[PDB]
């Protein structure tokens, strides 16, 4: 049922972009138990700031100290600059832009494919990001709703990509008629 397919894809793209951005921006990625601003208390650590709670001075928090064998250096660098989560956000943005431009400058039916490629790539970037984040954390604990927002963004993004590709296939099918 074309037409509702476009609305579903547009809504999905916006949702995935928003979820991934919120996940990167927010800092509830890991409920660890460590030192707040420089006694060990819980903390809602995130991608940038290890933030404190249930403490003498809960709510006062700082910037995680990423740095204290080139392999460890490279991984620490890639995890310090969340290049992968950030790249996921940029890709989702460009995908949405292409989907939107699919109304203007129509008849190209070649840009919506670009949208699908962007969404799929965003998902792959998101998974690499999760792997590096978990791997670096290994240098009790738990994961917060930011982590799961990132994961949900991955799933929605992949679905929106599959829909985009399906639409591109349908367009070329109609054209071949």
């Amino acid at each position: 049922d074309r037409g509702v397919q476009m609305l579903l894809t547009t809504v999905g793209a916006f949702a995935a972009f928003s979820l991934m951005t919120i996940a990167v921006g927010t800092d509830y990625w890991l409920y660890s138990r460590g030192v707040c601003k420089t006694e060990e208390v819980m903390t809602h650590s995130g991608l940038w700031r290890t933030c404190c709670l249930e403490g003498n001075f809960k709510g006062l928090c700082k910037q995680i100290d990423h740095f204290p064998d080139t392999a460890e250096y490279f991984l620490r660098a890639v995890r310090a600059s969340s290049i992968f989560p950030i790249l996921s956000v940029i890709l989702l943005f460009m995908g949405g832009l292409c989907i939107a431009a699919s109304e203007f400058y129509k008849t190209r039916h070649n840009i919506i494919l670009s949208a699908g490629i962007f969404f799929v790539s965003a998902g792959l970037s998101n998974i690499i990001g999760i792997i590096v984040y978990i791997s670096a954390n290994a240098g009790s604990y738990s994961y917060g709703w930011s982590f799961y927002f990132g994961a949900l963004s991955f799933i929605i993004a992949e679905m929106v990509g599959v829909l985009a590709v399906h639409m591109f296939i349908d367009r070329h099918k109609q054209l071949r008629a």
């Binding site: 494919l113 699908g116 490629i117 799929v120 998902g123 792959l124 998974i127 999760i130 792997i131 978990i134 994961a151 991955f154 799933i155 992949e158 990509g161 599959v162 590709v165 399906h166 591109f168 296939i169 070329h172 099918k173 071949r176």
Partner: protein
């Protein structure tokens, strides 16, 4: 018979004197009432003249030294916690996932979704291809490859085959490691107590443990002292065996605070249904005692040091 009786034997041997072994009717090591200024048990006996020496498991402390002369400790110890050793664990439903960590399973699922979507995209996106791989069939191919099972359709394109190859390698490493780690498996404190009010803990009525908790100023011990002074019924007991039975007869709902030596002895003696947990809150030692002005005080110190150097106390302990 026992350790203290032997010890008194070698102490009398080195000093040369004689000894007559006597028990206290009150069955208490000793303490003082802050109001009556009265001494109970062994300390009351020695101070009030009823005796002259205590070769016993008496604990050293500031208050007792003010009134009597102790020796150098003949064995070191510390307060400790005794609980009803919990029962062993049963494997558990959903234990078939234990060989791999939660994160590995989660990322396996995310990768399954990704591999499937990429195979669907590459297989059917170019109009020049219009490959039986739709999104449903792509997902089936990937699941079946992970479970090392039948294929029934195999990518024919170059790109589809790249995706398939990497998924195959991934599956080999992950499943091999699940099986290998299965083998591995198949072939091999106080704060937590203070936080839990459901679990009940108590101490001997008249002893260095009760006094140490009463005179304490630390947060955990202060909370414990308030709880004991308010925990009805009285968690305090009159004898060590009383606490032993209470822990052994409370289904793990009672804890006993006592010296580490007794825990070591009990856990090493059947029925072996209790355990020592965590570490020692305070460190002290058992010390022979004598009343002020006894002639035995000077030589008993030397006897204890000589036994320690000779290694006799270690042999008696063993």
């Amino acid at each position: 018979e026992g350790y203290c009786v032997d010890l008194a034997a070698e102490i009398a041997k080195h000093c040369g004197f004689k000894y007559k072994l006597t028990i206290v009717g009150d069955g208490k090591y000793g303490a003082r009432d802050a109001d009556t200024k009265i001494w109970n048990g062994m300390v009351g006996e020695l101070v009030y003249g009823k005796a002259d020496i205590a070769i016993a498991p008496l604990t050293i402390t500031l208050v007792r030294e003010e009134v009597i002369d102790f020796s150098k400790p003949f064995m070191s110890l510390g307060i400790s916690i005794m609980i009803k050793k919990p029962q062993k664990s049963k494997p558990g439903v959903f234990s078939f996932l234990d060989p791999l960590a939660y994160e590995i399973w989660m990322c396996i699922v995310f990768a399954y979704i990704g591999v499937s979507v990429v195979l669907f995209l590459v297989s059917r996106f170019s109009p020049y291809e219009w490959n039986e791989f739709g999104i449903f069939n792509s997902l089936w191919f990937s699941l079946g490859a992970f479970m090392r099972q039948g294929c029934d359709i195999s990518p024919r394109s170059l790109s589809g085959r790249i995706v398939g190859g990497v998924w195959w390698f991934f599956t080999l490493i992950i499943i091999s490691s699940y099986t290998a780690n299965l083998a591995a498996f198949l072939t091999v404190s106080a704060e937590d107590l203070s936080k839990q009010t459901e679990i009940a803990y108590g101490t001997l009525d008249s002893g260095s443990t009760k006094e140490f908790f009463r005179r304490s100023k630390i947060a955990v011990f202060d909370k414990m002292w308030t709880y004991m002074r308010s925990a009805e019924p009285s968690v305090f007991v009159r004898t060590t065996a009383e606490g032993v039975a209470r822990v052994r007869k409370s289904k793990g709902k009672y804890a006993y605070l006592l010296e580490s030596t007794m825990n070591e002895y009990i856990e090493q003696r059947k029925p072996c249904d209790t355990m020592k947990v965590g570490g020692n809150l305070d460190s002290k030692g058992y010390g022979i005692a004598t009343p002020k002005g006894s002639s035995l005080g000077t030589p008993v110190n030397l006897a204890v040091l000589k036994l320690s150097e000779q290694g006799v106390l270690d042999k008696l302990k063993n």
